[PDB]
Write an enzyme that holds these catalytic residues in place. Structure first.
Site, PDB file in Angstrom:
ATOM      1  N   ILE A 187       0.862  -1.171   0.000  1.00  0.00           N
ATOM      2  CA  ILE A 187       0.000   0.000   0.000  1.00  0.00           C
ATOM      3  C   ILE A 187       0.900   1.223   0.000  1.00  0.00           C
ATOM      4  O   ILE A 187       1.790   1.336   0.845  1.00  0.00           O
ATOM      5  CB  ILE A 187      -0.930   0.019   1.222  1.00  0.00           C
ATOM      6  CG1 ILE A 187      -1.843  -1.206   1.216  1.00  0.00           C
ATOM      7  CG2 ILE A 187      -1.748   1.317   1.261  1.00  0.00           C
ATOM      8  CD1 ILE A 187      -2.631  -1.391   2.564  1.00  0.00           C
ATOM      9  N   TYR A 188       0.683   2.130  -0.947  1.00  0.00           N
ATOM     10  CA  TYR A 188       1.415   3.384  -0.988  1.00  0.00           C
ATOM     11  C   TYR A 188       0.545   4.527  -0.475  1.00  0.00           C
ATOM     12  O   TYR A 188      -0.686   4.483  -0.552  1.00  0.00           O
ATOM     13  CB  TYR A 188       1.892   3.683  -2.410  1.00  0.00           C
ATOM     14  CG  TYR A 188       3.049   2.813  -2.845  1.00  0.00           C
ATOM     15  CD1 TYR A 188       2.831   1.563  -3.394  1.00  0.00           C
ATOM     16  CD2 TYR A 188       4.362   3.242  -2.696  1.00  0.00           C
ATOM     17  CE1 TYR A 188       3.892   0.760  -3.807  1.00  0.00           C
ATOM     18  CE2 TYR A 188       5.433   2.436  -3.105  1.00  0.00           C
ATOM     19  CZ  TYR A 188       5.187   1.205  -3.660  1.00  0.00           C
ATOM     20  OH  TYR A 188       6.241   0.410  -4.051  1.00  0.00           O
TER      21      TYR A 188
END
Ligand code: CA
Ligand code: CA
Ligand code: CA
Ligand code: CA
Lengths: 178, 178
Positions: A39-40
């Site tokens: 997840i960014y």
């Protein structure tokens, strides 16, 4: 407590990663296979897409890693400052980040097969929705040494490729709008 | 993945914490002693002192804990949302926070002696530069139940005290400018 990650990223044109794995099997030592879901995050007031920074929360075979990456320091390889910590709980770390004001940006998922050859790590990457890539990272290696090894690597195993210093996150965005 | 921390904090007027420990020794079960060094952080654009939030990196007997706390939900006890993760490396987590733009605000250091009594945790706190305090936290307890137990606790052990819902961070700031 910082470290410089230096790697080269190849988009594989031919043959398949399965066939490449067969070609390297005998001279390269298998390390492990990692299922990685990333997840960014972005900062609403400091567009990481302008400062070329990244904040990532990774689940790799159930191990949870929070990573900061700084701006690229090279045009010939993907070279960035990297700072990582393991955290106990992915949901809670994501909650903390969102409570602090960070917003989830995009998700990257892959299967990665890691091989070792004399202080080089070769990663065969099957990226969901993007396709097949290889990354080569250097352990206490100069940029020159990494570039030279990768040239020998692709030649020895008859790989057709395109190099890029774009991240998977950046490549994913390009792919979506096409 | 959130949890509501409910506790009462007492500034001890008399007797000493050493004498209080003697008075509770026989009916309360000793858990452990924690040496806790806390670094607090602020967001430059979201003054946590206005939103009543906190971000803390704690070293407690060498265990490293990143904690978010939300605004106070009560005037009678110190009641706040709390979200915590253990992290592998304090220096690296602090570096990540500073790379993200957080600024180190203040540091709190204490010795804490934890005792247990029927689903209540009693913490005897010796705070560097602030003095002697007791915290009582409830496990699956209502505010009413916590308030009633603390009243019984101070009466049973003849403690003279002042209650407060200010944090140690807030009390430290008040103390400095006096
Ligand atoms: Ca990479
Ligand atoms: Ca890498
Ligand atoms: Ca407390
Ligand atoms: Ca507490």
């Amino acid at each position: 407590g910082s470290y410089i990650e230096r790697e080269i990223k190849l988009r594989v044109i031919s043959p398949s990663l399965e066939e490449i794995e067969e070609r390297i099997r005998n001279n390269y030592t298998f390390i492990n296979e990692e299922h990685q879901i990333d997840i960014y995050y972005n900062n609403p007031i400091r567009d990481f897409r302008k400062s070329d920074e990244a904040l990532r929360l990774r689940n790799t075979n159930g191990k949870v890693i929070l990573t900061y990456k700084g701006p690229k320091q090279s045009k010939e390889t993907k070279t960035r400052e990297e700072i990582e910590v393991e955290v106990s709980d992915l949901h809670k770390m994501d909650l903390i980040l969102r409570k602090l004001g960070f917003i989830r940006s995009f998700q990257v998922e892959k299967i990665r097969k890691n091989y070792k050859y004399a202080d080089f790590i070769i990663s065969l990457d099957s990226i969901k929705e993007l396709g097949e890539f290889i990354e080569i990272e250097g352990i206490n290696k100069t940029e020159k040494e990494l570039i030279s090894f990768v040239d020998e690597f692709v030649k020895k195993h008859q790989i057709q490729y395109e190099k890029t210093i774009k991240s998977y996150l950046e490549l994913l965005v390009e792919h979506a709008k096409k």
